[PDB]
Amino acid sequence: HHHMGLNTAIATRVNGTPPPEVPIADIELGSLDFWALDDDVRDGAFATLRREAPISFWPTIELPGFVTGNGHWALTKYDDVFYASRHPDIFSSYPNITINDQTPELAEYFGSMIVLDDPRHQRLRSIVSRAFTPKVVARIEAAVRDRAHRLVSSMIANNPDRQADLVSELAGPLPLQIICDMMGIPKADHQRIFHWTNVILGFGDPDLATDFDEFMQVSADIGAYATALAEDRRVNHHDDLTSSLVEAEVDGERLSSREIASFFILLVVAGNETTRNAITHGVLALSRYPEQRDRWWSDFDGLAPTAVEEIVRWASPVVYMRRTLTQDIELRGTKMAAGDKVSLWYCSANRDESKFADPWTFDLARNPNPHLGFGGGGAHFCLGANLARREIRVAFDELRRQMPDVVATEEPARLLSQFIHGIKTLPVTWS
C-alpha cells in the first residue's frame, strides 16, 4: 500500500482449507438468521451434518405470507441426493420444490412443470427442449459471445475509475439478455423482467422484498406480461419460445393461460437467477485463488470444460431442491414417512468427502467432476445446463481478453436466501 486510494483487491485464501469446525449444536437450518451467516459457517455446518447426522429433520422457515408448513428431512450426502433425484416415484416434485408450499393464489403463477411429475411434466418439457439442446445453443453462441463482449467493453468505457459492480454490469445482464431474447421478450422490457425475477427469488431479503403484498403484485405483473406477450404471438408467430408455448398441443389440447404463464415465468426466473451467481462466485474464487486464475488464463480453451464445471460445483447456485415422499422409506437407518418433505442439499453433496477428493480445493482442472450443481440427474435435470455452461465460459473468456486482472475489491453482499446461493453485489477493479 504505497498510496491510499479507492480500493484494494480482497484478501486471498489458502486453497484447500476446510471450514472451521461447526458444533452440531450451532446448526440452525430452520432459522432465517442462520442463512445470513457466511459460507464458512454454512459449509462447516453441512460438513458436521454429513459426519454426525447425515439425515436430520428441520422446521420450515416462516416468512410473511408463507403457508404454515411441516419440517423436512435434510439429505446431506451425495449418494442420498443422487438416489432421491433418480427415484421420483418415491420422491415426488408435487406439490412444490421449495420447503414451504404454494398458496392457491401462487399456483396461478408457479404451477409449472418443475412442480409436476411425469407423464405431464415430460409432455410440457418437450415443448421447449429443442431450443436448449447443444446443437441449437451452438446457434446462439455468437450472440452469447457478442453480449458478453459488449458488456465487458462497456464496463471499461463507462468506469474511468476502473471499478464497477460485476453483478449489475456483467453477471446479471448477460444471462438476462440471452434468456429473454430466447423467449422473444423485446429488449426494452428486459430490465422489468429482471426486477420481477430478482424479487421472486429474493423474497425475505430486505434489499429485495419482504412485503408479501409486493411479492404477490410482482407475481401478478409478470404473469400479466407473459399473457400479453402470448396473446401477441397467437396472432403473429415469431421464432421464439413464447410462440412455441402458444402453438403447442398436448394430445390435442392447447396449454391453458395458467400453464403458459407459469412456463414463461419458470424459464425467465431460472435463466435470470442461477448463472449470474455461478459467474459472480467464480470471479470471487478467482480473486481468492489467483494461482487458479493464472492457470486458466495460460490455457483458456484447454481448461475451460473443467473450469466451468468446477465453478458450478464450487458455487452450487441452487442450494437445494425439495421433494415429497409418496411412501415410507428408510435411508441411513432413518425412517421417513409417506408425505414427509425431503430436502436435497446440493451445496452439501458438492462437498461430500466420501465422493470428492480434496473437496475444499477449488481445482479448475478437476476431472472427473460429477457434481450435483444441476441436480442429481433424472427427470428434472436442469433444462438450461448447456446454455449456462456457455454463458459461464464466454463471460470468463471476455474478462480474460479485456481485463485479465479483474479482481473483487470488497467481500460480496450475500442474498438472504436458503434456496439460491445469491450474491447481490460484487465490486471489482481492473487495470
Which residue in 22, 171, 388, 428 binds ligand HEM (CB under 6 A)? Answer: 388
Interface pick for ligand K2B out of 18, 30, 59, 65 (rule CB under 6 A): 65
Bridge partners of residue 428, in order along the sequence: 164, 408
Least distance CB 335 / ligand HEM (angstroms): 24
The site partner of 85 among ligand HEM, ligand K2B, none (C-beta below 5 to 8 Å per kind) is ligand HEM
Least Å from the CB of residue 275 to ligand K2B: 10
Binding residues among 179-208 for ligand HEM as defined by CB under 6 A: 179
Task: Tell me how crowded residue 141 is: count the other CB atoms within 10 A of its CB.
Answer: 13
Q: Which is nearer to ligand K2B, 73 or 110 (CB)?
A: 110
Contact characters 108-137, ligand K2B, x per CB under 6 A = --x---x-----------------------
Instruction: Tell me which residue has its CB nearest to ligand HEM.
Output: 384
Nearer of residues 48 and 196 to ligand HEM, judged by Cβ = 196
d(CA 16, CA 351): 12
Nearer residue to ligand HEM within complex by CB, 173 or 384 = 384
Question: Which listed residue (266, 283, 284, 388) binds ligand K2B by CB under 6 A?
Answer: 266
Contact call for residue 222 and ligand K2B (CB under 6 A): no
Contact mark string toward ligand HEM, 123..152, x via CB under 6 A: --x---------------------------
Work out whether 278 is an interface residue with ligand HEM (CB under 6 A). yes
What would the x/- binding string for ligand K2B be over residues 191 to 220, using CB under 6 A?
---------xx-x-----------------
| CB 269 to ligand K2B: min, Å | 4
Q: 314-373: which residues touch ligand K2B (CB under 6 A)?
A: 318
Q: Is residue 267 a contact point for ligand HEM (CB under 6 A)?
A: yes
Query: Known binding site: residues?
Result: 382
Question: Residue 256 contacts by C-beta under 8 Å, 6 or more apart in sequence?
Answer: none
Three-state secondary structure of the chain: CCCCCCCCCCCCCCCCCCCCCCCHHHCCCCCHHHHHCCHHHHHHHHHHHHHHCCEEEECCCCCCCCCCCCCEEEECCHHHHHHHHHCCCCEECCCCCCCCCCCHHHHHHHCCHHHCCCCHHHHHHHHHHHHHCHHHHHHHHHHHHHHHHHHHHHHHHHCCCCEEEHHHHHHCHHHHHHHHHHHCCCHHHHHHHHHHHHHHCCECCCCCECCHHHHHHHHHHHHHHHHHHHHHHHHCCCCCHHHHHHHCEECCEECCHHHHHHHHHHHHHHHHCCHHHHHHHHHHHHHHCHHHHHHHHHCHHHHHHHHHHHHHHHHCCECEEEEEECCCEEECCEEECCCCEEEEEHHHHCCCCCCCCCCCCCCCCCCCCCCCCCCCCCCCCCCCHHHHHHHHHHHHHHHHHHCCCCEECCCCEECCCCCECCEEECEEECC
Considering CB distances under 5 to 8 angstroms, the limit depending on partner class, which of ligand K2B, ligand HEM, none binds residue 78?
none
Among ligand K2B, ligand HEM, none, the one that 427 touches (CB under a kind-dependent 5 to 8 A) is: none
Give 183 or 399: the residue with its C-beta nearer to ligand K2B. Answer: 183
Site membership for ligand HEM, residue 378 (CB under 6 A): yes
Q: Which of 174, 260, 286, 321 contacts ligand HEM by CB under 6 A? A: 321
Nearest alpha-carbon partner for 346 in 323, 369, 321: 321
Bridging pattern class, strands 413-414 and 423-425: antiparallel
Stretch of 35-43, 99-107, 300-308, 341-349 lying at the interface with ligand K2B (CB under 6 A): 99-107
3 vs 187, beta carbon nearer ligand HEM: 187
Residues that bind ligand HEM (CB under 6 A): 85, 113-114, 125, 175, 179, 266-267, 270-271, 274-275, 278, 312, 317-318, 321, 346, 373-376, 378, 380-384, 387-388
